[PDB]
Symmetry: C2
Subunit: 274 residues, 2 copies
């Protein structure tokens, strides 16, 4: 590193009781790291690690505070993310830090994030979200088992048309009916992929082709997925043509940063480094 | 961590040729991390690791830039510090980042610091510096061998009256005449300690007493130094009375943050986390 990402804010549309008691009326967002802001037009769902443990982090609504109470008064926004990502967010001014009282005495200043609580990925499966740019009104949180808690926020947005991982993990849900009974996954949470990008070689549903081309059978086949992902990434950046949005018609390489800046302008996204 | 520090900017008063060719007319500062902003009244010298390798980092004069040339135009300030500290500075907005061209292709953004070059601590020994708050007009860079390159910036300010390390390392220079011949250390670079803080138990030159009390013989006796340092730190914060500056008369615990904020206001210091 360091590597640069776009942090995508997915707004919880209906906050459940178990969070509502802790967040007390604040806006809550699930926050995902992506390398591909231009693909937000094709989001079908959101991915979380079922046994991942995530923080409920107090965030700026968009200086290190001395009082917990003043931060709590001044921030009306919570981000669900890995503790680890929250610290990176803090260094970079995205969430507040306070001078913590949890250890030591007043002769040292120990900056800490304000974490209201802890939440397991499992508990969030089924949560409705307003996401930017996708035509779907609401998309839903679903389990992905390939998620590393040591990268990004541990939360990942799903664009199955142009991500081999996302295609593979949604297919595992679509086929394996034990998986759906287990996590109590309703049918209406599983949304259809969307055509968003033309790749002149492969057409408009490039992730499925590549998953067939590498003979990928589930989300777990990581060595092959890695090869699919590296191929799709470069070919789509240089040769992919957007068929959605303001920059419809343009190549990804020419539109990507413009799309990213409009998401940032509109409050859907932030620049993030780790 | 994370731990909070004050970054002290020590301005090079006479920039030598070997740096002048690389920095090309820019203001240069040597940057030190301290836990004790209130002790800047007693600075006698600055400490560097002789075989430490430091960056010449482009800094804001006080958004990730796409062009090296625009950063170079917009920044007239260089900070000498460890590469590692510079990255922390970058995350925290203290020095610019650029989208680097050193590896890969334009499909990924790789934020990098702008390092003009490399410099060994040895090469800086004898450099004259304007430091804040000390009565001395100029203080000088000298070698300290206990410095860890994995902490702070690898550069440390020297307050021998109230730091056991600083007292011990200056004494090693004062006594050991081979050490002075080796690094070519002139006499006029070795400045006398200054009384700055009364500790009701020990008086006004508390570091020397403690070095005697722990029977500390050189800067290398780290296990004992650790005990001296932990004792002096807490006793001075809670019981130490300043005899210098605007808050002369006051206890350190009441003056410390006020002093720190005035250094920040006046452009001598910055808040720094690692
Ligand atoms: C690798 C190509 O990634 C692609 C390719 C196509 C598309 Cl359409 C996308 C992405 B990408 O998914 C996120 C993020 O961008 C990408 C970050 O990859 P890097 O190795 O951590 O640098 O991996 C995914 N990611 C982020 N955090 C993750 C985590 N904790 N665990 C597993 N995967 C994660 O976003 C879109 C929609 N998913
Ligand atoms: C430990 C008490 O430190 C004292 C005690 C008294 C006084 Cl008057 C001072 C400090 B203190 O010296 C710096 C800095 O503050 C302190 C940081 O200690 P922590 O363990 O890295 O958190 O250690 C020192 N330090 C910073 N970076 C260092 C490094 N890379 N290597 C060795 N020591 C370093 O500042 C003043 C003037 N020197």
């Amino acid at each position: 590193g360091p590597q640069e990402y776009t942090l995508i804010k997915l707004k919880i549309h209906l906050i459940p009781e178990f969070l509502g008691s802790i967040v007390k009326g604040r806006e809550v967002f699930v926050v995902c790291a992506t390398l591909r802001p231009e693909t937000m037009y094709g989001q079908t769902n959101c991915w979380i690690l079922p046994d991942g443990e995530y923080d409920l982090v107090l965030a700026f609504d968009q200086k290190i505070f001395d009082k917990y109470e003043d931060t709590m008064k001044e921030c009306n926004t919570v981000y669900i993310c890995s503790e680890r990502s929250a610290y990176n967010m803090a260094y970079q001014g995205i969430v507040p830090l306070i001078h913590g009282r949890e250890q030591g005495v007043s002769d040292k200043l120990l900056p800490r994030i304000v974490s209201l609580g802890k939440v397991y990925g499992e508990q969030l499966i089924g949560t409705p979200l307003s996401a930017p740019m996708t035509p779907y009104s609401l998309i839903f949180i679903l389990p992905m088992f390939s998620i590393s808690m040591e990268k990004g926020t541990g939360i990942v947005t799903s664009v199955p048309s142009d991500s081999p991982d996302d295609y593979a993990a949604l297919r595992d849900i679509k086929t394996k009916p034990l998986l759906r009974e287990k996590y109590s996954i309703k049918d209406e949470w599983i949304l259809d992929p969307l055509e968003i990008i033309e790749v002149p070689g492969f057409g408009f549903m490039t992730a499925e082709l590549l998953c067939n081309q590498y003979k990928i059978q589930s989300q777990n086949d990581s060595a092959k997925l890695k090869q699919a992902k590296e191929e799709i990434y470069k070919k789509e950046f240089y040769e992919g043509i957007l068929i959605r949005g303001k920059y419809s018609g343009m190549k990804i390489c020419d539109a990507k940063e413009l799309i990213r800046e409009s998401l940032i302008k509109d409050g859907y996204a932030l620049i993030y480094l780790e």
